[PDB]
Amino acid sequence: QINTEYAVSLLEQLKLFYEQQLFTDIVLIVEGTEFPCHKMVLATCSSYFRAMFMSGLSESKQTHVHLRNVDAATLQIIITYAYTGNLAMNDSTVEQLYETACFLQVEDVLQRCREYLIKKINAENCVRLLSFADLFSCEELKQSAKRMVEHKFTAVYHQDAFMQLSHDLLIDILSSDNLNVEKEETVREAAMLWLEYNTESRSQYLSSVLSQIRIDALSEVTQRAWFQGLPPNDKSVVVQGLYKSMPKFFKPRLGMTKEEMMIFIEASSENPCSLYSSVCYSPQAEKVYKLCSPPADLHKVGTVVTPDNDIYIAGGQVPLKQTAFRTVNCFYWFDAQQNTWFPKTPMLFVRIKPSLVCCEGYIYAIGGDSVGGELNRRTVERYDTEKDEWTMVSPLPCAWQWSAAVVVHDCIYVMTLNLMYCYFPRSDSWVEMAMRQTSRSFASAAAFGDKIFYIGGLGSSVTVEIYDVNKNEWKMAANIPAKRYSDPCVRAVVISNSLCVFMRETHLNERAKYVTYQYDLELDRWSLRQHISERVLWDLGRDFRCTVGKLYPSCLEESPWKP
Amino acid sequence: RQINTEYAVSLLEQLKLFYEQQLFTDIVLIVEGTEFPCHKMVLATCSSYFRAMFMSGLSESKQTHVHLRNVDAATLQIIITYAYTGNLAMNDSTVEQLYETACFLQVEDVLQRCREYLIKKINAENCVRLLSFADLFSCEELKQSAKRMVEHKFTAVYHQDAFMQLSHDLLIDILSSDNLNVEKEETVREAAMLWLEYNTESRSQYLSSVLSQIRIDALSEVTQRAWFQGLPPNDKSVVVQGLYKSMPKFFKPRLGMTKEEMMIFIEASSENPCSLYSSVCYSPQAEKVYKLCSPPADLHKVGTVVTPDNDIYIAGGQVPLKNTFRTVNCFYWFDAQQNTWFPKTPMLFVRIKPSLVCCEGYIYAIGGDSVGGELNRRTVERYDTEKDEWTMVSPLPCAWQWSAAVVVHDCIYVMTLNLMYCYFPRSDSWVEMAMRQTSRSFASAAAFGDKIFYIGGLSVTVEIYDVNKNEWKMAANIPAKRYSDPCVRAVVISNSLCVFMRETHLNERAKYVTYQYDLELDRWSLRQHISERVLWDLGRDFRCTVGKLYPSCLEESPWKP
């Protein structure tokens, strides 16, 4: 191999020459700023300077080149990267950095900024990044922007930059089958408002934008509104659209295929070659669709589903390369369509079984057997979904183990064996709450409306303690009627605007039975909503978690397994 | 920060590619008609002369073609390719010209690399040549190393052709130094004379200077008559100046005369509990116990060998892994004056307690757990003291453990439990020899005269073998106290066969005593009893070998009687 010591010595000597200006022969003249540099470094880094000097043109012998349509700071950072390899990339100058990299055709900085932008893609810059990837040919960025823009924009459709988009880009966006919309009318009104941004600059594109939307809205309202905005005496558009909506037979999209499903993680692996797996139950389809494995079989993790219906994974441990397990603070995000886990910004401290709770767009991970264990062994930390970073919050006053947390009334409610503390995001403080009369642990709670339903606790039992936020008191309702001499595995969840329970029971010398019940809020009784047949759902285990979310049956595949 | 992962390797490789394609070049070097297009930046960053060649404002700074002379084409090409790729790939022949060109071009890195290569390759013959080379081009490290090597070897050769052509200052430094490894004072006198006989009437003043340098002890023997035979005619004041060098200039004894025949011991009972083993020495005549520095200071289970030129070598050994005994094939050599250990070319197999045998100037390592898992478990490997390399030879006939090997009549002899094979260096083959009637192991043999004396084994078995007769016979039993396990050590002392044995009983202290053995008497006469007031306990795995050492360079071992 090439001697790295001599390579770094040569590089540092060249950078010293650059700083001291000894062997510089070519100077870059940009907006009156002198940039003394060498030809060898520029040729090695950029693919434009190699065609600027070794070309035989008038600049081959000229020692002063007036490089135009560039920026001084961008050129300076590119030159210093070419001379030392350090590329300091902030969150603002990456746009002009990519512009100058494309202008100068430098592959290394182009790849680096492409990776930075593939990491930086978020909701508030999705349309801007897609427009940037349309301006400069970049297929990876274009595809990532396609996916993220489709999802987040069809969720939001309010960005100001969406109005200033090319016709081809909008045709690609609207005609795609990856849009995430609960209805087919929101895309219609989004297209209408985009068209009405201008009057005559969009008339020619009117015949094309309607060609990608289904005819179910091409004969109903929002056709006379276009006639109102039609240019005067234009008889080539009204009669055109009058007899035009014959083709494009109505085909349902993919965004209207989200159903309230119970996502399960760390289920019992069917094949003994793997430790655990992830499955999902369909309360409506009455089937069990398989889910992608956790990233690097990440066990002992926590789940959260934001009001925007997004799944996240935090904490967990990976078997170190017989008992062998090491805890890692890696963070991941689940793609609802690609059926894969996209990595995100990792946490600061590793966790085991963390309680992920979403509130005000922030992901809160409370506790989880942190590595530190100092006097603040109860330190909790939130995540920024806008800036893609983690921020510490007010620590929990008391150290708790095997706890659960929910969000009610824009506040974080973490529950332990007998104590409860409410966190105020506005003031970053903890307030003492009501005290339970029973010592129970290893249970889960579901936030339904303005009440907290702590179900089960210790196997578990059928004890239920209902807490009211407005009343600040713990009261008993009833006990779930289950078979005696059994060990039910209770799982509290909210579904169909009602509090249902996923309770798996096992009898003596008998296999586990799956059945869910609907708890009557006013009657204080668990009614049999549906019985899960064992012909579709097999054993899941004991350390499995359940959460409420929506998934697409089309993108996912049915799990092939014998009843 | 110098990021070595992406840019450094890529930048260096692209610069090399640009050099290959003759791209972006602006300076070309003319060397006796050969053209070397290159770049100014690489020459500036590598050589400390090209930076002044292209930066200092003169007529050659703005000069597309430069005619650089007094430089070899191949050396400049290899320097340029080293600057463009970082790899030197130096041979053993073009080192002198490469170093000369590096010194002319002031390229510090390649200068240091060549200095290390030259200081590692002062083997046997280029010592005076590279000493003169270092005198021409000032190099303190090379100068000192070559001076020590010359003081060690030229004092035994003093006939090298290159030694005749030396500058006066270097010769004065060599001769006036008190590091001459000569047991007699006339050899240096005749060396100086022969250095002043081939070049006479040209260095007459330097002749007088060297005459004064050699001093009275050798000046009063023959030099006057030889000079009278060889003096130029009509020289009178030269007689006056030569007659003056009889009384003055501090006649003092030399250092090479102190070649006392002693015994080098390894793996002794360390005094400080922090250390495990130590290497010490014993003086048969001075009746003193000297110490030596451990070669690795941490590795043990080494083997010793002594060449006829009184040199000490250490090969193989095992060292603890120091995790939070691994075998190492390293090699070392003991300095007779610096009391240190300079490493040499390592072996190819990690041996445990190798048996090194010297013959025909070559070091032969026989057995000693080569790798253990060999397809042919019975193999050997020798050493070249001149070429400094390891050469594979014909393997062992049979696989043996705890064996011993000696050299007799320029022939390799290895002894095992009951078998013995003679290895012919000329034909590189093993010939079957006589078989012992007694099966004894864990013993060593001594090569005294033309007879091999295999002593001990499990005892006091004295089996004498003769090469000319090819037979094994018994002589007697060494007188040792009963209820004891003697530790026998057979070695040559002052051209007389003697033994060094220690007896240990129950609830009794060890006693050290050496006896004088006679060939025709078959008796070990009491020669000298080693008093415990000067020598302490050694141990069980200690080894003994015969060699000459310097008392002044070494240090006495402090121990309470």
PDB file of N, CA, C and O in Angstrom, chain B residues 420-462:
ATOM      1  N   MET B 420      23.186 -40.246  16.984  1.00  0.00           N
ATOM      2  CA  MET B 420      24.022 -39.112  16.621  1.00  0.00           C
ATOM      3  C   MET B 420      24.185 -39.088  15.109  1.00  0.00           C
ATOM      4  O   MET B 420      24.437 -40.123  14.489  1.00  0.00           O
ATOM      5  N   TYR B 421      24.036 -37.902  14.526  1.00  0.00           N
ATOM      6  CA  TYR B 421      24.188 -37.707  13.092  1.00  0.00           C
ATOM      7  C   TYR B 421      25.209 -36.610  12.833  1.00  0.00           C
ATOM      8  O   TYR B 421      25.229 -35.590  13.528  1.00  0.00           O
ATOM      9  N   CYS B 422      26.055 -36.828  11.830  1.00  0.00           N
ATOM     10  CA  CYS B 422      27.053 -35.852  11.418  1.00  0.00           C
ATOM     11  C   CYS B 422      26.586 -35.189  10.128  1.00  0.00           C
ATOM     12  O   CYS B 422      26.315 -35.874   9.137  1.00  0.00           O
ATOM     13  N   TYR B 423      26.491 -33.863  10.145  1.00  0.00           N
ATOM     14  CA  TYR B 423      26.054 -33.104   8.982  1.00  0.00           C
ATOM     15  C   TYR B 423      27.276 -32.591   8.233  1.00  0.00           C
ATOM     16  O   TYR B 423      28.156 -31.959   8.829  1.00  0.00           O
ATOM     17  N   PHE B 424      27.332 -32.868   6.935  1.00  0.00           N
ATOM     18  CA  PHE B 424      28.449 -32.439   6.107  1.00  0.00           C
ATOM     19  C   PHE B 424      28.128 -31.084   5.489  1.00  0.00           C
ATOM     20  O   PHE B 424      27.243 -30.991   4.630  1.00  0.00           O
ATOM     21  N   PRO B 425      28.811 -30.014   5.905  1.00  0.00           N
ATOM     22  CA  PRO B 425      28.542 -28.701   5.298  1.00  0.00           C
ATOM     23  C   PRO B 425      28.830 -28.658   3.809  1.00  0.00           C
ATOM     24  O   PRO B 425      28.156 -27.918   3.080  1.00  0.00           O
ATOM     25  N   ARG B 426      29.815 -29.422   3.335  1.00  0.00           N
ATOM     26  CA  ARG B 426      30.173 -29.394   1.920  1.00  0.00           C
ATOM     27  C   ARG B 426      29.084 -30.007   1.046  1.00  0.00           C
ATOM     28  O   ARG B 426      28.773 -29.474  -0.024  1.00  0.00           O
ATOM     29  N   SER B 427      28.494 -31.121   1.481  1.00  0.00           N
ATOM     30  CA  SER B 427      27.495 -31.824   0.690  1.00  0.00           C
ATOM     31  C   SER B 427      26.069 -31.598   1.173  1.00  0.00           C
ATOM     32  O   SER B 427      25.129 -31.976   0.465  1.00  0.00           O
ATOM     33  N   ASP B 428      25.887 -30.998   2.351  1.00  0.00           N
ATOM     34  CA  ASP B 428      24.565 -30.722   2.917  1.00  0.00           C
ATOM     35  C   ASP B 428      23.747 -32.009   3.052  1.00  0.00           C
ATOM     36  O   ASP B 428      22.679 -32.170   2.457  1.00  0.00           O
ATOM     37  N   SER B 429      24.274 -32.933   3.853  1.00  0.00           N
ATOM     38  CA  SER B 429      23.620 -34.214   4.077  1.00  0.00           C
ATOM     39  C   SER B 429      24.016 -34.746   5.446  1.00  0.00           C
ATOM     40  O   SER B 429      25.019 -34.329   6.032  1.00  0.00           O
ATOM     41  N   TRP B 430      23.214 -35.680   5.948  1.00  0.00           N
ATOM     42  CA  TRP B 430      23.442 -36.305   7.244  1.00  0.00           C
ATOM     43  C   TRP B 430      23.938 -37.730   7.044  1.00  0.00           C
ATOM     44  O   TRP B 430      23.392 -38.471   6.219  1.00  0.00           O
ATOM     45  N   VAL B 431      24.967 -38.107   7.796  1.00  0.00           N
ATOM     46  CA  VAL B 431      25.522 -39.456   7.764  1.00  0.00           C
ATOM     47  C   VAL B 431      25.357 -40.081   9.142  1.00  0.00           C
ATOM     48  O   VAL B 431      25.573 -39.423  10.167  1.00  0.00           O
ATOM     49  N   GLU B 432      24.940 -41.344   9.165  1.00  0.00           N
ATOM     50  CA  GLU B 432      24.714 -42.039  10.424  1.00  0.00           C
ATOM     51  C   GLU B 432      26.028 -42.258  11.163  1.00  0.00           C
ATOM     52  O   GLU B 432      27.052 -42.593  10.562  1.00  0.00           O
ATOM     53  N   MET B 433      25.992 -42.066  12.477  1.00  0.00           N
ATOM     54  CA  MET B 433      27.149 -42.240  13.343  1.00  0.00           C
ATOM     55  C   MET B 433      26.845 -43.315  14.387  1.00  0.00           C
ATOM     56  O   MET B 433      25.813 -43.990  14.335  1.00  0.00           O
ATOM     57  N   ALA B 434      27.760 -43.469  15.341  1.00  0.00           N
ATOM     58  CA  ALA B 434      27.624 -44.502  16.356  1.00  0.00           C
ATOM     59  C   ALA B 434      26.453 -44.205  17.288  1.00  0.00           C
ATOM     60  O   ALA B 434      26.070 -43.051  17.498  1.00  0.00           O
ATOM     61  N   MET B 435      25.884 -45.270  17.845  1.00  0.00           N
ATOM     62  CA  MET B 435      24.747 -45.186  18.750  1.00  0.00           C
ATOM     63  C   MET B 435      25.196 -45.478  20.176  1.00  0.00           C
ATOM     64  O   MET B 435      25.884 -46.471  20.429  1.00  0.00           O
ATOM     65  N   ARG B 436      24.804 -44.607  21.104  1.00  0.00           N
ATOM     66  CA  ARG B 436      25.144 -44.793  22.507  1.00  0.00           C
ATOM     67  C   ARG B 436      24.370 -45.964  23.095  1.00  0.00           C
ATOM     68  O   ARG B 436      23.203 -46.189  22.761  1.00  0.00           O
ATOM     69  N   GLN B 437      25.032 -46.712  23.978  1.00  0.00           N
ATOM     70  CA  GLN B 437      24.396 -47.831  24.660  1.00  0.00           C
ATOM     71  C   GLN B 437      23.490 -47.392  25.802  1.00  0.00           C
ATOM     72  O   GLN B 437      22.719 -48.213  26.309  1.00  0.00           O
ATOM     73  N   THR B 438      23.563 -46.130  26.215  1.00  0.00           N
ATOM     74  CA  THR B 438      22.753 -45.605  27.304  1.00  0.00           C
ATOM     75  C   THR B 438      21.799 -44.545  26.773  1.00  0.00           C
ATOM     76  O   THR B 438      22.191 -43.684  25.978  1.00  0.00           O
ATOM     77  N   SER B 439      20.544 -44.613  27.212  1.00  0.00           N
ATOM     78  CA  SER B 439      19.507 -43.670  26.797  1.00  0.00           C
ATOM     79  C   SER B 439      19.358 -42.617  27.889  1.00  0.00           C
ATOM     80  O   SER B 439      18.698 -42.848  28.906  1.00  0.00           O
ATOM     81  N   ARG B 440      19.974 -41.456  27.676  1.00  0.00           N
ATOM     82  CA  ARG B 440      19.924 -40.352  28.623  1.00  0.00           C
ATOM     83  C   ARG B 440      19.585 -39.063  27.890  1.00  0.00           C
ATOM     84  O   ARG B 440      20.092 -38.810  26.794  1.00  0.00           O
ATOM     85  N   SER B 441      18.724 -38.251  28.504  1.00  0.00           N
ATOM     86  CA  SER B 441      18.316 -36.982  27.917  1.00  0.00           C
ATOM     87  C   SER B 441      18.530 -35.842  28.905  1.00  0.00           C
ATOM     88  O   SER B 441      19.085 -36.051  29.987  1.00  0.00           O
ATOM     89  N   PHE B 442      18.088 -34.636  28.538  1.00  0.00           N
ATOM     90  CA  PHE B 442      18.239 -33.442  29.372  1.00  0.00           C
ATOM     91  C   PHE B 442      19.700 -33.180  29.727  1.00  0.00           C
ATOM     92  O   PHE B 442      20.016 -32.780  30.850  1.00  0.00           O
ATOM     93  N   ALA B 443      20.602 -33.403  28.774  1.00  0.00           N
ATOM     94  CA  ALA B 443      22.030 -33.227  28.988  1.00  0.00           C
ATOM     95  C   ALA B 443      22.639 -32.489  27.804  1.00  0.00           C
ATOM     96  O   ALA B 443      22.039 -32.380  26.731  1.00  0.00           O
ATOM     97  N   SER B 444      23.848 -31.979  28.012  1.00  0.00           N
ATOM     98  CA  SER B 444      24.589 -31.243  27.000  1.00  0.00           C
ATOM     99  C   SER B 444      25.954 -31.888  26.789  1.00  0.00           C
ATOM    100  O   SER B 444      26.422 -32.692  27.599  1.00  0.00           O
ATOM    101  N   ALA B 445      26.592 -31.522  25.680  1.00  0.00           N
ATOM    102  CA  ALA B 445      27.895 -32.054  25.316  1.00  0.00           C
ATOM    103  C   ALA B 445      28.858 -30.906  25.045  1.00  0.00           C
ATOM    104  O   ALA B 445      28.451 -29.787  24.721  1.00  0.00           O
ATOM    105  N   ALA B 446      30.147 -31.199  25.185  1.00  0.00           N
ATOM    106  CA  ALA B 446      31.208 -30.226  24.971  1.00  0.00           C
ATOM    107  C   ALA B 446      32.163 -30.733  23.901  1.00  0.00           C
ATOM    108  O   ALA B 446      32.478 -31.926  23.850  1.00  0.00           O
ATOM    109  N   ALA B 447      32.621 -29.819  23.049  1.00  0.00           N
ATOM    110  CA  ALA B 447      33.546 -30.142  21.965  1.00  0.00           C
ATOM    111  C   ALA B 447      34.939 -29.689  22.388  1.00  0.00           C
ATOM    112  O   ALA B 447      35.369 -28.574  22.092  1.00  0.00           O
ATOM    113  N   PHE B 448      35.650 -30.568  23.088  1.00  0.00           N
ATOM    114  CA  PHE B 448      37.007 -30.305  23.552  1.00  0.00           C
ATOM    115  C   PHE B 448      37.972 -31.111  22.692  1.00  0.00           C
ATOM    116  O   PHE B 448      37.931 -32.347  22.694  1.00  0.00           O
ATOM    117  N   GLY B 449      38.843 -30.413  21.970  1.00  0.00           N
ATOM    118  CA  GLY B 449      39.795 -31.099  21.109  1.00  0.00           C
ATOM    119  C   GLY B 449      39.081 -31.860  20.010  1.00  0.00           C
ATOM    120  O   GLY B 449      38.222 -31.321  19.304  1.00  0.00           O
ATOM    121  N   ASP B 450      39.437 -33.136  19.862  1.00  0.00           N
ATOM    122  CA  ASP B 450      38.847 -34.010  18.855  1.00  0.00           C
ATOM    123  C   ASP B 450      37.925 -35.053  19.483  1.00  0.00           C
ATOM    124  O   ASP B 450      37.611 -36.070  18.860  1.00  0.00           O
ATOM    125  N   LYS B 451      37.486 -34.814  20.716  1.00  0.00           N
ATOM    126  CA  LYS B 451      36.640 -35.757  21.432  1.00  0.00           C
ATOM    127  C   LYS B 451      35.413 -35.041  21.975  1.00  0.00           C
ATOM    128  O   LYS B 451      35.515 -33.931  22.504  1.00  0.00           O
ATOM    129  N   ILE B 452      34.257 -35.685  21.842  1.00  0.00           N
ATOM    130  CA  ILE B 452      32.995 -35.167  22.356  1.00  0.00           C
ATOM    131  C   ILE B 452      32.723 -35.822  23.701  1.00  0.00           C
ATOM    132  O   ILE B 452      32.767 -37.053  23.823  1.00  0.00           O
ATOM    133  N   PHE B 453      32.442 -35.004  24.712  1.00  0.00           N
ATOM    134  CA  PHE B 453      32.238 -35.470  26.082  1.00  0.00           C
ATOM    135  C   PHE B 453      30.784 -35.214  26.469  1.00  0.00           C
ATOM    136  O   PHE B 453      30.435 -34.127  26.935  1.00  0.00           O
ATOM    137  N   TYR B 454      29.938 -36.223  26.274  1.00  0.00           N
ATOM    138  CA  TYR B 454      28.537 -36.146  26.671  1.00  0.00           C
ATOM    139  C   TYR B 454      28.440 -36.456  28.159  1.00  0.00           C
ATOM    140  O   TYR B 454      28.645 -37.600  28.577  1.00  0.00           O
ATOM    141  N   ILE B 455      28.130 -35.441  28.961  1.00  0.00           N
ATOM    142  CA  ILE B 455      28.130 -35.550  30.414  1.00  0.00           C
ATOM    143  C   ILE B 455      26.709 -35.370  30.926  1.00  0.00           C
ATOM    144  O   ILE B 455      25.982 -34.476  30.475  1.00  0.00           O
ATOM    145  N   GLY B 456      26.315 -36.223  31.868  1.00  0.00           N
ATOM    146  CA  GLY B 456      25.009 -36.125  32.484  1.00  0.00           C
ATOM    147  C   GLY B 456      23.921 -36.800  31.671  1.00  0.00           C
ATOM    148  O   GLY B 456      24.144 -37.363  30.599  1.00  0.00           O
ATOM    149  N   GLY B 457      22.710 -36.734  32.211  1.00  0.00           N
ATOM    150  CA  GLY B 457      21.547 -37.326  31.572  1.00  0.00           C
ATOM    151  C   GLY B 457      20.704 -38.119  32.551  1.00  0.00           C
ATOM    152  O   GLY B 457      21.202 -38.672  33.535  1.00  0.00           O
ATOM    153  N   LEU B 458      19.406 -38.175  32.277  1.00  0.00           N
ATOM    154  CA  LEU B 458      18.472 -38.907  33.126  1.00  0.00           C
ATOM    155  C   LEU B 458      17.314 -39.467  32.309  1.00  0.00           C
ATOM    156  O   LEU B 458      16.981 -38.943  31.245  1.00  0.00           O
ATOM    157  N   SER B 459      22.460 -37.469  35.184  1.00  0.00           N
ATOM    158  CA  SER B 459      23.249 -38.186  36.179  1.00  0.00           C
ATOM    159  C   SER B 459      24.732 -37.847  36.051  1.00  0.00           C
ATOM    160  O   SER B 459      25.098 -36.694  35.823  1.00  0.00           O
ATOM    161  N   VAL B 460      25.582 -38.861  36.201  1.00  0.00           N
ATOM    162  CA  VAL B 460      27.028 -38.674  36.139  1.00  0.00           C
ATOM    163  C   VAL B 460      27.610 -39.542  35.033  1.00  0.00           C
ATOM    164  O   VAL B 460      28.754 -40.002  35.126  1.00  0.00           O
ATOM    165  N   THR B 461      26.829 -39.772  33.980  1.00  0.00           N
ATOM    166  CA  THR B 461      27.286 -40.599  32.870  1.00  0.00           C
ATOM    167  C   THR B 461      28.359 -39.862  32.078  1.00  0.00           C
ATOM    168  O   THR B 461      28.120 -38.762  31.567  1.00  0.00           O
ATOM    169  N   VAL B 462      29.541 -40.468  31.976  1.00  0.00           N
ATOM    170  CA  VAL B 462      30.648 -39.885  31.225  1.00  0.00           C
ATOM    171  C   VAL B 462      30.932 -40.753  30.008  1.00  0.00           C
ATOM    172  O   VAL B 462      31.666 -41.744  30.094  1.00  0.00           O
TER     173      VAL B 462
END
